[PDB]
Design a protein around this nucleic acid. Structure first.
Lengths: 46, 271, 94
RNA sequence: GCUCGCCGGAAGACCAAGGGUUCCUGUCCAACGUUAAUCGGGGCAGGGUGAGUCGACCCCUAAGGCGAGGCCGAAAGGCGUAGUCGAUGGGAAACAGGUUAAUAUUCCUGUACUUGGUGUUACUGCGAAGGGGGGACGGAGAAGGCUAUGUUGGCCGGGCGACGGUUGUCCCGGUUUAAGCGUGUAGGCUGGUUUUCCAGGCAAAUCCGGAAAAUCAAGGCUGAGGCGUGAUGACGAGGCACUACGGUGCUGAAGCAACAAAUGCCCUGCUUCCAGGAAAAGCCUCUAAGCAUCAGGUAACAUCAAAUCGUACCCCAAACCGACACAGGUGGUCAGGUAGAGAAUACCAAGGCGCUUGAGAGAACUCGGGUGAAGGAACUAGGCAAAAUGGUGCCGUAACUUCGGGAGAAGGCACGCUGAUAUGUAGGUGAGGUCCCUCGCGGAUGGAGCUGAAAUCAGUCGAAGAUACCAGCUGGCUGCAACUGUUUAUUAAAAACACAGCACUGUGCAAACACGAAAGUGGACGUAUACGGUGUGACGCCUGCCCGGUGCCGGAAGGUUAAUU
RNA sequence: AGGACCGAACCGACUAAUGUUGAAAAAUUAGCGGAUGACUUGUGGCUGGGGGUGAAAGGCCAAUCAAACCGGGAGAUAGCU
């Protein structure tokens, strides 16, 4: 049964990756909240 | 001409081809090609705007001279071609200085015929000239609305426009709708009728031919749930309401033309 | 022409293995742990300066460091760059 | 280690994705492994991924994204020009053998190739952000030439039989060799060559395009495969010497022909059809500015460079997605023998496994099966399930019909093996020989040899010859829907939806309508034989009456009537 | 030639049984439909929640849908338990 997570790292980095976050205003406000929470992994990106 | 085909399958059974023998069997003129790609009915926001479009066969774009300009150079028709873009046929045509161009194919016309654009030119089908120089009562087609702009009226495949009256700077057109329209009389038109006149004499035969022409299927409104249409829902087949568009405005009869800019040009409406 | 500081920077180490010793005795190559930014011309010019030897050509590869667990706590070794350097013939190296 | 069994269009081998050391070696059995565990994808330690030619990177662009200015928007921001990104597509080049415990088209050996500089010498119009050509393109069908590959014979090596026979028409094994280079073949496409002119290709152009005029039909392009070379090499059955029993070292014969044959190649071909089938760059060519006897251009040679990154391992799964060592999902590539139409299926090869609890016993009952007297749907809501039919050729085949069908209608007959026709036939393939030859990868003849159905007749075995696997149950009446399709992922596949066809209605183009505070976009690079909405749903015969009500359309004489004054 | 026929891959899911603390949060087995097209599939993109998309079932939109999920108003309110 074809389950939902069907990974590819190009699509992952295009969708949730760092420059994808950094392009838009709310995507920076992701990165603001994750720094201020203090996340070890910031984005998804290796 | 038409053919019916023999019903040797279901869904072959009701088909009519329009075939034409003399259309050019082979590849079109590769300067005057270009790419056109498909919308899927979706604008730059990517929402569907005009529904029931998608798919269908890959199409190139023939660049067709409507604007039609090379005045007092004679050309000669090389060949007639299918156009997937449009309902009429096109003519690859060859001027004396060795430009080739695509025109619409007018009705009489074939290979070796001679065409000439602009003001001198002899009033045969194919020729183009301003319609202060067209004599009154002609059938013409591919019709400029503004001067210099290019042919916008009567292009598709069996149509034409009537020139009823000329009063000074304007002529009056009986359009294919049965409108009457004042158009400024230094607009160009091409003589005669546009070509592929049995184009309505096709019928399609099956759903697949509509799909190859790229027409996604139409769900009628009373099938739906009433969230989806105004017509929607109801136990069994119910429809106790006035028939509307899916955004809920009346479709049987109610006129929609709002354009007060152009209303001096409309002499009489269609009926 | 490559700077003497960089040439003295490039070589970290000879590498010791069975494959090292067999390639040395047979096909006349050393293997070096080198700097991970070091390029092939840098390695060639460095070893030609710095052991005064003649070299044919150099192949590189990157080793990726293993992932270990020092007790519970997870932990990764460094990647490093590994250079197969064949000499010209009848060059000896210590 | 010896047997047994299973997969074999896979349960084998290789890639992409995804994973990230799971790979190899030593060592350990606390935990993990559905049990034990000396074993492991477990722990711990060490090792292992080598590229000018593979791929990424790079050059080029699609969908699309971002977007200087710009347009628009309370702000945020939206759209978008120049551009610049974006592969899943285009663009240069390496193969064979050998090697490690683990890598190899990367290392070693042999044999090549590509692109750039530089430097010579020979020659002389170079030059683009521009022009032109090319790249460059659909579906379906059909053969023809081939090849991979297989079979048989020949040759070479070995063997002479655990039990009757087996020196022979006997058994077993091997019989391999690439890229490149040279030749240019089956084939396909195209008339070439010269001269002159020209409203075209944004300017120019010798280039293209178009007009003339002369001359020759033979010239160009493309092209599988074969052949020669690569290769006196490597490989090679086996032998012969050692042995860390794991393997190591040395030597090494034959290495041909015929037939069959692809879904692979020629073929981005040819033929046909309509639904009319990317772009840009590399590349070829043209000239513009400019230069100027320089630069550059191409020619051989010499030399240098080709960086960086990935390269282990799994990859139809114990390593990816499913919480699991999960009966699930997962794109591409290779495709042996026999029988078979076949990639079905059966047994097998190469190769890989026996699915991580076993041992007994042989109760009920459950599950998956096999068989069954006599009856044959009496069961049941209902022939649910089971049972049954099933291949090829030939005969024959109803109502009805839109003349296509219905129809494989129904139903029946032959089927194995052996001999003869015919020591193997029809057919296919086709060597020598001979002749011609503008001379070869040529053309005729000629059939050696090889392969090889189908039928008839006769005989013979069994209960049974389409013997296993595989492989339609059929007919009659009728409701509904014309039909192929689509649908409630996970209780509904239908009469529901869609559909071709029909009708109404809107819409003259800056259209209607739709998404959008707007710009803008779709419609559509379309133009009333077009597009949108609504209802109906092939086709045949049709589609009656009512405008009182509610809508809609048209009219503007009167009444009523907002802001305003 | 064919939205032709029969039938593998492939796509689908009509019937029955098992399974229902399953091998599996929809599968296996035996049959079944399509299988050159309105087919199917890989890679990437686009459409965003009163919105999309829908051959229309109120289906689907990360095992969630008559208005997704996450955070916030928010200790909503709760004559009810």
């Amino acid at each position: 049964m074809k389950r939902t997570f069907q990974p590819s790292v190009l699509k992952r980095n295009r969708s949730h990756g760092f420059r994808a976050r950094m392009a838009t205003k709310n995507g920076r406000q992701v990165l603001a909240r994750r720094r201020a929470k203090g996340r070890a992994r910031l984005t998804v990106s290796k | 001409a038409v053919v019916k085909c023999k019903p040797t399958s279901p869904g072959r059974r009701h088909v009519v081809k329009v075939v034409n023998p003399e259309l050019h069997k082979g590849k079109p003129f590769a300067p005057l090609l270009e790419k056109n790609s498909k919308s899927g009915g979706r604008n730059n926001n990517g929402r569907i705007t005009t529904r029931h479009i998608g798919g269908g066969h890959k199409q190139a774009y023939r660049i067709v001279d409507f604007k039609r300009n090379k005045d007092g150079i004679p050309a000669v028709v090389e060949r007639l071609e299918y156009d997937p873009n449009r309902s009429a046929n096109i003519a690859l045509v060859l001027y004396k200085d060795g430009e080739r161009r695509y025109i619409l194919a007018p009705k009489g016309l074939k290979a070796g015929d001679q065409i000439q654009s602009g003001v001198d030119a002899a009033i045969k089908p194919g020729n183009t000239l301003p319609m202060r120089n067209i004599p009154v009562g002609s059938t013409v087609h591919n019709v400029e609305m503004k001067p210099g702009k290019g042919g916008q009226l009567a292009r598709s495949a069996g149509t034409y426009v009537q020139i009823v009256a000329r009063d000074g700077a304007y002529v009056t057109l009986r359009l294919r709708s049965g409108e009457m329209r004042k158009v400024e009389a230094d607009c160009r038109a091409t003589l005669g009728e546009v070509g592929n006149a049995e184009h309505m004499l096709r019928v399609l035969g099956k759903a697949g031919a509509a799909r190859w022409r790229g027409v996604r299927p139409t769900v009628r409104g009373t099938a739906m749930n009433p969230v989806d249409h105004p017509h929607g829902g109801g136990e069994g087949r119910n429809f106790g309401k006035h028939p509307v568009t899916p955004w809920g405005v009346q479709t049987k009869g109610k006129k929609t033309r709002s354009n007060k800019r152009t209303d001096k040009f409309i002499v009489r409406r269609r009926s | 022409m490559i700077r003497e500081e960089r040439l003295l920077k490039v070589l970290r180490a000879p590498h010791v293995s069975e494959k090292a010793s067999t390639a040395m005795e047979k096909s006349n190559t050393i293997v070096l742990k080198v700097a991970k930014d070091a390029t092939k011309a840098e390695i060639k010019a460095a070893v030609q300066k710095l052991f005064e030897v003649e070299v044919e050509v150099v192949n590189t590869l990157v080793v990726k460091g293993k992932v270990k667990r020092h007790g519970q706590r997870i932990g990764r070794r460094s990647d490093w760059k590994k250079a197969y350097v064949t000499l010209k013939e009848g060059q000896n190296l210590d």
